[PDB]
Amino acid sequence: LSSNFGAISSVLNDILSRLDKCEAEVQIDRLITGRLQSLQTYVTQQLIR
Amino acid sequence: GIAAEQDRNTREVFAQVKQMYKTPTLKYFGGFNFSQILPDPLKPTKRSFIEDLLFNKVTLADAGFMKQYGECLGDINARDLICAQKFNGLTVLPPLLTDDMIAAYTAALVSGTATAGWTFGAGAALQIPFAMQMAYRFNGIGVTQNVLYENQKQIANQFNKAISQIQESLTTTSTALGKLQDVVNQNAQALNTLVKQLSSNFGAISSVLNDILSRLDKCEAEVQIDRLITGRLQSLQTYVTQQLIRAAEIRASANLAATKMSECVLGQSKRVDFCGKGYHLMSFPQAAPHGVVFL
Amino acid sequence: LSSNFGAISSVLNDILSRLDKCEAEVQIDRLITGRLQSLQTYVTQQLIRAAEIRASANLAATKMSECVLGQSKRVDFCGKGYHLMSFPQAAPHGVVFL
Amino acid sequence: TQHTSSMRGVYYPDEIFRSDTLYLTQDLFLPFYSNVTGFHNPVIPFKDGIYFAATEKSNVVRGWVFGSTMNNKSQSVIIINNSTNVVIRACNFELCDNPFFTMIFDNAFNCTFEYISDAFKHLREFVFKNKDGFLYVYKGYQPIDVVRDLPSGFNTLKPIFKLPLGINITNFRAILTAAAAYFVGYLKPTTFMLKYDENGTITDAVDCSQNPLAELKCSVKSFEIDKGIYQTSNFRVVPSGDVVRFPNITNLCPFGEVFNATKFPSVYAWERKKISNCVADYSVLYNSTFFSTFKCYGVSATKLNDLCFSNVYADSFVVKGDDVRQIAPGQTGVIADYNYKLPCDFMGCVLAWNTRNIDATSTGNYNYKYRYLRHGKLRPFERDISNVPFSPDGKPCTPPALNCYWPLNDYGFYTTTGIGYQPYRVVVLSFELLNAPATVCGPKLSTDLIKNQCVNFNFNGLTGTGVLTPSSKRFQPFQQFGRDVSDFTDSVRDPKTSEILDISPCSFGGVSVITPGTNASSEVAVLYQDVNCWRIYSTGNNVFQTQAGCLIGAEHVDTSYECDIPIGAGICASYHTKSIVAYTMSLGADSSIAYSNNTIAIPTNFSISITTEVMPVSMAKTSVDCNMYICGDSTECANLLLQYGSFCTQLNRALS
Amino acid sequence: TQHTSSMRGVYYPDEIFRSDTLYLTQDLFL
Amino acid sequence: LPSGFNTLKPIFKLPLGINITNFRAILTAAAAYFVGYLKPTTFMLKYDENGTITDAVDCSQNPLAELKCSVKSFEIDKGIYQTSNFR
Amino acid sequence: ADYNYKLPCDFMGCVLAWNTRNIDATSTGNYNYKYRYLRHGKLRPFERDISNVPFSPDGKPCTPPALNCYWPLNDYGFYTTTGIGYQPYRVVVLSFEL
Amino acid sequence: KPTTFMLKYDENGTITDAVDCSQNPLAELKCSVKSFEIDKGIYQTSNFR
Amino acid sequence: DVSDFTDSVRDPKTSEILDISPCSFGGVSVITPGTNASSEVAVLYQDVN
Ligand SMILES: CCCCC/C=C\C/C=C\CCCCCCCC(=O)O
Ligand SMILES: *[C@@H]1O[C@H](CO)[C@@H](O)[C@H](O)[C@H]1NC(C)=O
Ligand SMILES: *[C@@H]1O[C@H](CO)[C@@H](O)[C@H](O)[C@H]1NC(C)=O
Ligand SMILES: *[C@@H]1O[C@H](CO)[C@@H](O)[C@H](O)[C@H]1NC(C)=O
Ligand SMILES: *[C@@H]1O[C@H](CO)[C@@H](O)[C@H](O)[C@H]1NC(C)=O
Ligand SMILES: *[C@@H]1O[C@H](CO)[C@@H](O)[C@H](O)[C@H]1NC(C)=O
Ligand SMILES: *[C@@H]1O[C@H](CO)[C@@H](O)[C@H](O)[C@H]1NC(C)=O
Ligand SMILES: *[C@@H]1O[C@H](CO)[C@@H](O)[C@H](O)[C@H]1NC(C)=O
Ligand SMILES: *[C@@H]1O[C@H](CO)[C@@H](O)[C@H](O)[C@H]1NC(C)=O
Ligand SMILES: *[C@@H]1O[C@H](CO)[C@@H](O)[C@H](O)[C@H]1NC(C)=O
Ligand SMILES: *[C@@H]1O[C@H](CO)[C@@H](O)[C@H](O)[C@H]1NC(C)=O
Ligand SMILES: *[C@@H]1O[C@H](CO)[C@@H](O)[C@H](O)[C@H]1NC(C)=O
Ligand SMILES: *[C@@H]1O[C@H](CO)[C@@H](O)[C@H](O)[C@H]1NC(C)=O
Ligand SMILES: *[C@@H]1O[C@H](CO)[C@@H](O)[C@H](O)[C@H]1NC(C)=O
Ligand SMILES: *[C@@H]1O[C@H](CO)[C@@H](O)[C@H](O)[C@H]1NC(C)=O
Ligand SMILES: *[C@@H]1O[C@H](CO)[C@@H](O)[C@H](O)[C@H]1NC(C)=O
Ligand SMILES: *[C@@H]1O[C@H](CO)[C@@H](O)[C@H](O)[C@H]1NC(C)=O
Ligand SMILES: *[C@@H]1O[C@H](CO)[C@@H](O)[C@H](O)[C@H]1NC(C)=O
């Protein structure tokens, strides 16, 4: 959960603390896709086990 | 590969016998009534009464494999799911074996069991009257055969009553065939999930390719199109992975059905609780939508 | 390994040859995520194939146990007919039973 | 006159060496077995590149002229051989009606480009293409013996010329000497797959749009196909016509009333005007009015003539030169905080121009004001008009006192000041796109409606490809479009006659290709689901209906066998005496045993049989290295990968 | 004086026609 | 105020640019009027075959509505479902 | 950008421009520089149009002393005393591949 | 020199041990698994560079 | 290559063709007992004689 996935930071508080809503919603979407990808990988491994 | 495996599964389960025995004219073998599990030559269908009930219990989705273009353009007010799937590149292929062929296979197996017994699996079929075959089945579980020969009326009546009870149980709406419905529900739900998953924009301006091509030039738009390309490719990959895992589960089930059909219909088994509760005497196969029912 | 995954190029040398470190570290991160995704897909396919091979090997082991070391009563479990004997032979990645 | 180009005219797509690879590319190519026109000297049209072939015995063809108008009024380029050198000259010349051999022209005067080379039974092939102001010429040579037609074969062309001309080329004509023949074909945007040798030479190619077998070859990226049935791409049709539907508007849109007004307000009291029912042709502004800054957000400028705009508002005010940079999203300063603020999700354009000769007088113009004191920032598109004395603590005060100020400052506009203290007029246009009824459109002309046919359409700026049908939906008056569950636009209201139309895709239906091995034959059979035997690529031979679908290219036989190609629904195919045959598969051998109640059958003799059974046990053990696969011998990439280490150890654990 | 708004006051969120769908949205609602 | 369900249609989009914090009604010299306040909320709306909104689900009313909004359906089968954590 | 000089998107190069009021601007007014403001379509990238033919909105040939017939080229009027937005600038565009 | 290290923190937030990831293949293995303790066995490390 | 890796070049001073190859090659395995027992390891290199 500490990977930034090619964004400014891995902390949502830093992005909301420094940018406006505006440039930040496109840095938040990278984190959203990365964490969704991580959950999907976990679910696939669990299905095989 | 998955589709080829599904055809191999059906072939390995149903096509075990090598010669297609004809249905005998007489359905009454020494007190035992075999009419409800064999086809009759007067009704239009090619399958038994129990197979009729089994095919009536399971509801289908496509009911054929032919949806013409003019038919999909004739039903627009009615938002049919199959037209949306076919308009989005998802198609369903027909099975290799028709339901009539599987019904013919099960009819041949039941006729061979009722006429030849157990000997048509080791080699060529050997004819034998049904009472002597019943005597051998009784002798196989440690009971002498005079017990059969002195109580034949009672055993025949109990056999007929049990068949009638199975028929009466299968005429009432229940969840006996509940593990055949889950397969069709999962397949339909997976395709509909891909269709509904097609409205995510994946961090782009819009989820509509027409809006991007309508507003930007080619130039800034080819980098918004590439995000959608990677997202939709990712969605297809997730669908394929789930399908592979489900295919593995179905293949394990089909292997168990094939070995049970081999060891319980073509012979008598000594394994405890492998075929029914009690001492095994016989087994009969019946075809079902995407599956098999053993009696 | 030749997909650029929505970057300027698929060659790391071209990106390091033309941009500075600065704009290039955000083009390199796209390639990093794409190649990591490719490796993950390969590993998932390998796990599923390994499960299939393990099921086949378990069936081969129990057949070797029950048909070479003894005589089996199970119908059609070892050959067509009444089982008398069985002999194992080695094969590339597998076993042949007679 | 009409001949075919049988695998004719392939060239090298780039300047990169490749060997023993198959390369799939998409470019302007001459399609296989396409029509070519023979000439045994009119004006032949030039349609985005040509293939030219000359069959010669006495060197009759000498060069070409390329141009558009072909008179003295536009530029033309001559590429000729005058028997000692090859000279290329792009100039402005008066053409002759009968050019021959030795004057090809009368006079030249506006010459732009010049190039002279060094001084010095046959088939000479050329490819000409025009792209980004460059004329590319490719050349190839082949010794032949034919006398009438273009010979069949395969020959690869090499690049010889890349000329920086910048010329409108739509027409061309050949130059002859006072026998020979020449052939002309046209290039199309097409996907090819090319094969390279071990010497880095192209020796074979596959045209991916020729037939379904070539589509299968391009899909698997191989020249050899094994025996079986393969699901290819679905059935597609290409669009035929064009439909453009725009509202019928007559008035030119009031550029003069907005941009040329005698009085603009101050920035704290900016004014808003609605724009409606107009045609916005900004090309009438190219004669008189010029803008120092013009920057738009939410839409590219090059598409502004192809769209139609829904809710157009124009805001007008006047600022100084240093404040024009503040009229932008996400900006700070006195103007952006206290006078005029823009959102982020802004859609529109901003225009500003210098007005020192109109809004600046000598001695000093003091009629423009701005607010510099406030108790909070403004919200987007919010106006503050009040003039109340300001106190930092927040309580009311009388202006002749202490810590009480007037919140408005004057702009002092002089003639002699620098440009940073000069007045600028600013107009901001804001609108929305493609989600609502619209009445301000571009100058594009409309077209008649076409029903029940795959067309390209343009409805109020929304473009696409599909089939339009009459609909039964009932739109409410404030609605214009309709969408699916997958956000696909499936309904539209026609802006001229208020009827509802349904839009459907053009491609539909699965296609399978049944083939034997590529070594056996190049013949295939095609199975179309979802068609009743129409929507087929071609009516070859033996069309009949099966239970699986419509089968084309196979023969139906009454006898039943085992099958090697499973088609489906009980139908199978094979390769028999040769041709492809289709039949119903056999379930097994017929047998009859008769039931008796008093007879038994007993075996009397026996045989010993030995049966083989093969089973897999293990597979290959493998390992991967993340660092080499992702970042091969790169330190910067390894540093960037350093924070993905948890992901890589999971893969290694799985493999181990 | 005090009453309850029992499923009161829903409006159309945009100007796009939709039929036979369920649409999930986030906006200013009662 | 009577109970029920009724869908409202857009009539006005006025470009005013005004600081609005207070309001007052105007009457004639019986009647009653009711005032409620809007909140940022997630709803799920159902459309007919005529393109009319006839039902809605407020996703923050109770855990059953949270379950309905999670599965995107108006009908829930018998069983136990793991909803979102306590917030 | 529409009628005189247009750049592609996949441009590779650099653009340089500098002010030249002390060289290309004279008193009274320098009228030797021209630009086209009337055309029947937009230019393609790196395409040049040189012709000087009278322009008619309907599209038919006409004689310039008539109605709805214009000359398609306008003069730049370069003075010394004008503001910097009406002063001449020299522009050089370099294009290459890498 | 520019080098990758792995540092260990106490419960008091003090650095008390470190691993130099380029010293020997055992340290490469330790930095790959992010642990100071290795169990008995054979491990495939990075390729020869 | 087939993976778009630049493997050949022409030298611009003398017109000869040169091949470019990577520097890293060959798998390495580390055999270890527990870290409690010893810090000694054995190294197995495939692809070397
Ligand atoms: C001299 C010490 C300054 C210390 C500043 C510390 C951090 C930087 C934060 C704010 C400084 C921004 C100054 C910009 C002034 C407004 C510009 C304008 O008119 O639009
Ligand atoms: C045997 O079954 C058939 C079908 O149910 C029935 O008609 C027949 O009467 C049965 N025979 C006896 C003896 O009950
Ligand atoms: C090619 O020529 C043949 C013969 O004249 C004609 O039938 C066919 O329509 C032509 N095709 C095209 C695309 O011009
Ligand atoms: C152009 O050609 C026409 C006739 O072809 C001639 O009358 C005219 O003088 C020519 N103009 C120039 C500039 O050569
Ligand atoms: C061909 O053209 C070149 C161009 O100047 C000229 O030098 C040469 O003499 C010409 N050759 C003949 C045979 O006229
Ligand atoms: C083109 O020719 C005409 C007449 O010969 C001339 O007036 C004009 O200046 C020329 N164009 C250029 C760019 O020199
Ligand atoms: C010049 O090129 C443009 C760009 O396509 C084209 O529209 C125009 O017709 C060409 N000129 C002539 C005379 O054909
Ligand atoms: C490559 O070129 C050499 C040149 O001597 C030739 O001998 C060889 O046959 C060529 N390779 C092929 C595959 O033709
Ligand atoms: C625009 O305003 C200027 C004032 O500087 C005036 O000269 C010009 O005629 C106006 N334009 C029109 C079309 O009237
Ligand atoms: C452009 O402006 C000039 C200057 O008054 C005028 O003579 C000319 O007619 C205008 N052109 C058009 C097409 O209106
Ligand atoms: C112009 O638009 C109106 C709008 O309804 C329409 O009634 C009318 O038919 C249109 N004019 C033409 C010539 O179609
Ligand atoms: C369409 O196909 C069906 C078989 O599915 C057939 O019965 C019917 O006759 C066909 N339609 C026509 C018009 O022949
Ligand atoms: C049948 O058995 C006899 C001995 O009983 C043997 O000689 C003969 O070979 C057997 N038949 C065959 C076909 O082998
Ligand atoms: C005007 O709007 C601002 C923006 O929120 C607000 O802070 C201020 O209180 C409003 N004015 C009054 C008098 O309430
Ligand atoms: C849709 O509108 C028609 C108008 O005649 C009405 O009859 C129909 O009942 C409506 N549909 C529903 C589901 O109420
Ligand atoms: C942390 O600091 C306290 C200070 O009193 C000390 O007693 C304790 O031992 C320290 N922790 C460790 C792990 O050394
Ligand atoms: C300079 O380049 C030429 C190009 O071939 C080459 O022949 C020559 O050796 C080079 N000079 C030196 C000193 O290497
Ligand atoms: C290389 O290894 C092989 C064993 O694979 C061995 O036979 C051979 O002798 C070795 N080479 C040398 C030079 O010893």
Author numbering:
A (entry chain B): 948 to 996
B (entry chain A): 751 to 1045
C (entry chain C): 948 to 1045
D (entry chain C): 31 to 70, 78 to 138, 150 to 168, 180 to 237, 249 to 603, 619 to 662, 672 to 750
E (entry chain A): 31 to 60
F (entry chain A): 209 to 237, 249 to 306
G (entry chain B): 406 to 503
H (entry chain B): 258 to 306
What's the paper's own text on this?
Among structural proteins of Sarbecoviruses, spike (S) protein is responsible for receptor binding and mediates membrane fusion between cell and virus to initiate infection. We introduced these three disulfide bonds in equivalent positions in the SARS-CoV-1 S sequence generating three spike variants: S/x1 (S370C and D967C), S/x2 (G400C and V969C), and S/x3 (D414C and V969C). We determined cryo-EM structures of SARS-CoV-1 S/x1, S/x2, and S/x3 spikes and we identified various previously undetected conformations for SARS-CoV-1 S through classification procedures.
The S/x3 spike was only observed to adopt a symmetrical locked-1 conformation, its protomers share very similar features as S/x1 locked-1 protomers, with bound lipid and residues 602–619 forming a flexible loop. In this study, association of lipid binding and locked conformations were observed for SARS-CoV-1 S/x1 and S/x3 spikes. We have proposed that these interactions rigidify this area preventing structural transitions needed for RBD opening. We further demonstrated an engineered RBD “down” S/x3 spike as an immunogen. After priming by 10 μg of S/x3 spike, mouse sera showed induction of neutralization titers against SARS-CoV-1 pseudovirus. A boost by another dose of 10 μg of S/x3 spike increased neutralization titer further by ∼100-fold. The complete immunization regimen induced a serum neutralization titer of ∼5 log10 dilution units.
